[PDB]
Amino acid sequence: NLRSQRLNLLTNEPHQRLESLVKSKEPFASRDNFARFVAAQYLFQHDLEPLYRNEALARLFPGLASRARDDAARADLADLGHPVPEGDQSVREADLSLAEALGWLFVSEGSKLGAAFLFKKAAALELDENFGARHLAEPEGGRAQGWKSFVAILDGIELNEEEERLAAKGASDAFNRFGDLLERTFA
Numbered sequence: 001n002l003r004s005q006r007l008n009l010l011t012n013e014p015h016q017r018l019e020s021l022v023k024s025k026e027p028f029a030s031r032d033n034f035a036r037f038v039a040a041q042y043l044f045q046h047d048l049e050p051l052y053r054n055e056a057l058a059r060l061f062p063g064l065a066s067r068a069r070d071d072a073a074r075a076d077l078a079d080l081g082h083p084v085p086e087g088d089q090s091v092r093e094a095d096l097s098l099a100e101a102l103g104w105l106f107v108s109e110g111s112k113l114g115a116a117f118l119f120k121k122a123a124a125l126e127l128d129e130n131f132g133a134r135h136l137a138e139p140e141g142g143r144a145q146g147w148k149s150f151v152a153i154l155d156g157i158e159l160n161e162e163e164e165r166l167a168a169k170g171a172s173d174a175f176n177r178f179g180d181l182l183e184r185t186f187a
């Protein structure tokens with residue numbers, strides 16, 4: 001019924017595939033490997049920037065701007081001595097509909113879930129919230145409620161059937177994009 005639940009079903013496979021891809025790149029084998037993972041996160045933030053700063057979406061999601069993680073990820077790349085990668089502008093210039101944008105935000109916000117596990121694994125590489133893993137630090141209100149607050153708004157929006165299709169497309173496209181970014185930074 002809820003939009004969030006439908007999106008969860010629709011992206012269950014892409015998620016399993018993505019989780020497997022991440023495990024295969026061995027992000028915690030070394031700081032260099034971890035840095036390549038941070039580079040992928042950083043590039044995904046560049047794709048999402050125009051959405052987190054969009055006035056229309058900011059009105060729908062109060063506090064939107066502060067959900068971005070670009071400064072932290074860029075600071076982490078600097079800590080790790082990894083040069084910042086160049087964004088290809090493909091998503092920023094894609095001219096996404098509002099509905100597609102909701103699917104991209106769904107995936108970006110959802111990608112924060114379980115980050116405490118990644119944060120814990122980063123400790124093995126002697127990294128933490130003040131060095132190298134700044135982008136995985138837990139948010140103020142806590143990961144849980146941050147997600148619950150976002151989903152309540154998402155599920156309340158009224159969309160027509162075409163817009164629902166576009167939101168699903170946006171979520172699918174975002175999962176595929178993160179995978180492309182990982183293949184790029186680990187190449």
Ligand code: HEM
Pocket residue numbers: 008011015018019022023106107108109110111112113114115117118174175178
């Ligand atoms: C770019 C997309 C995403 C990436 C890169 C991603 C990656 C991951 C990874 C690698 C893990 C395993 C963490 C660990 O090592 O323990 C994971 C766990 C998880 N992901 Fe995602 N994810 C993404 C999007 C999403 C979305 C959209 C949702 C939800 C709508 C989601 C929900 C979860 C949850 C619930 C867990 C398990 C958390 C727990 O066990 O407490 N993820 N994800």
